[PDB]
Amino acid sequence: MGVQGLWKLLECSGRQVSPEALEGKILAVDISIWLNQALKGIENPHLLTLFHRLCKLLFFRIRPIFVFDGDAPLLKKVTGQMFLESQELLRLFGIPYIQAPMEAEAQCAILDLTDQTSGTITDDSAIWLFGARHVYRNFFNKNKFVEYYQYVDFHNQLGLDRNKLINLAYLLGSDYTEGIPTVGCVTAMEILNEFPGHGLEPLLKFSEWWHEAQTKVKKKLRTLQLTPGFPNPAVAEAYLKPVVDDSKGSFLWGKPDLDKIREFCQRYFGWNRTKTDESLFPVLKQLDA
């Protein structure tokens, strides 16, 4: 997912934060990535993963907002029952959620930019291209820490802004475009620095020069194979003006309903009161405290 290689390029701006430091923070969560990750990793694994991660989030007293994907963009190349079961569990835990118009990541980004949230929990590097400022990656991985990324930090460290990120998506490949073969981070940044310009002008100049010929960086730059339509401006316009809902929300966090969560866990996982309570009671004692 995301832009090929972008996280490794942003490595220099990553921070190690511990979950306890996120107490009280309102954070958005893209649940579609969870539902796909747990789909391939047991009868209801998506719901089991969702339950354990909800317990982890509420244990650290985070106030999460789950964001579901809507209609996929045409440029972008799993069941509704899973959506419904997930929303049922979220209501049982008292977690607000929203249905994105289209891209969930773009909606998380707009919640960030409108200061309705303190950031987004996701592993999708494409959220930077939608304008995100604060991202929490690898929240549930094998490490004892979450990776934290601030836009301003890698903007200062690397000079990357939204337009340069979109051009990197053109060069490296993303959900919306295939990217140029063999081109990696070093080559793509060489291309973007060789042809300075605002907006998409770097890639327009690069395509113009590659169509023309067909300098010691141009040496290998004119060995790349470019599609006839490169670059497709629909990609940049989808990244720059994604369909989102930028209205101010009215987010409320209710209290978890212990008995209905017991019933849910019994029906979907086969758990009795005791096994469910083993997971719930630390969460509840952290909340009521």
Author numbering: 1 to 41, 50 to 85, 764 to 900, 912 to 986
Authors' own words:
Nucleotide excision repair (NER) is an essential pathway to remove bulky lesions affecting one strand of DNA. The XP complementation group G (XPG) endonuclease cleaves the damaged DNA strand on the 3′ side of the lesion coordinated with DNA re-synthesis. Here, we report four crystal structures of the human XPG nuclease domain (XPGn) in the absence and presence of DNA. The overall fold exhibits similarities to other flap endonucleases but XPG harbors a dynamic helical arch that is uniquely oriented and defines a gateway.
